[PDB]
Design a protein around this ligand. Sequence first.
Ligand SMILES: N#CCc1ccc(Nc2nccc(Nc3cc(C4CC4)[nH]n3)n2)cc1
Length: 313
Amino acid sequence: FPEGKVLDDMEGNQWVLGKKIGSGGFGLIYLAFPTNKPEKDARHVVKVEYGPLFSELKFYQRVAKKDCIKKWIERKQLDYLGIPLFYGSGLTEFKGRSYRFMVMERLGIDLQKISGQNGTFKKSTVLQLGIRMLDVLEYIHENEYVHGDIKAANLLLGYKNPDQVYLADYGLSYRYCPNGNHKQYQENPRKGHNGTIEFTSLDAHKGVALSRRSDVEILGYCMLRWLCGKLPWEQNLKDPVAVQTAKTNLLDELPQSVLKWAPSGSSCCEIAQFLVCAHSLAYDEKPNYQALKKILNPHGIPLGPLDFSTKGQ
Ligand SMILES: N#CCc1ccc(Nc2nccc(Nc3cc(C4CC4)[nH]n3)n2)cc1
C-alpha cells in the first residue's frame, strides 16, 4: 500500500498513512495522521487484515470508549488504564479485494522483545504488571469481555509514556456476559485448546467458553513465567493435553507446586496466593480484583516506573 494513501472511516474521518511499523499473522501496521490536525506527531496507527481483526473491532467499539474510560480512571484513582484508545474503522480497496482497518493509539515496544535474562523480569516489575493488568481486566470484564490471551508479546509500553503498560491484541477476546447473560458451562472438545498453549486457561483446554476466571488463571501463569524464567510444562508445548494435565497438577498441588519453583533470590508467595485465590472461583464468579491486588502487593507499596534494567544479564 503506498504511503500518502487517504482512508475514510465509517465516521467520515480521513486518515493519511505512514511507513509500515511491523506486522503479525493477520495484520499489517502503518503509522497514520488525521488529514486536518498537524503532522509533527504520529499519535495514530492503522491495523489492516481484510476474522481476528473483527473480534478486536467488536471489542474496541463496545469497550474502549474514551470518556467512559475517563469516568473510570477518575473514580478508582488510577494514574491510567492499560487499554489502547480506538479512533474509528472502515473498509478500503487495494486490488479488487476490500480490507478492514482500525485506527488505534500509537504505542511503544512489546515486553517479550525486551525480556531481561531469558524471559525474566525483576519481581517488583512482575508484581506491578500483574496489578496493572488487574486494572485492565476489571474494566473489560465489567464491559462483558475477556481477553483470553494475556502474554508478554501483547503487553506494550506507551508511546507518549513508556512507564505506562497496555494490553493489546483482542483477537481472541470473547463477550462472556452479553447484556448480563453469563454464558452456560459446556465442555466442547471440538473447540478445545485454543489460545497460547503456554498460558491458555484449563477452561480453554476443555473447550469451555472463556469467562472471567480464565483471564485470572492466565495472568497467574504469566507472572510465574516472568519470575522463575519458564514453566513446568516448557517441555510439553506440542502436546496440549500434556500441558492441560500439568496446569491441572499445579493448581491441585498449590501452594507448594508454585513456592518450590521460584529460584532462591526471589519469592512466589504472592503468585502462589494469587493462583490459590484464582482457583477458588466458580465458572461465573466475579473475581475480587481489590483483594488480588493486595495479594500481589502485601506491603501496600506504591508503584514506581517499570524497571526493565538488565544490568549483568
Ligand atoms: N511491538 C509490536 C508489534 C505489534 C503489532 C500489533 C499490535 N496490536 C495492537 N493492538 C491495539 C493497538 C495497537 N497499537 C500500536 C501498534 C504500534 C506499533 C506497531 C508497533 N504502536 N501502537 N497495536 C501490537 C504490537
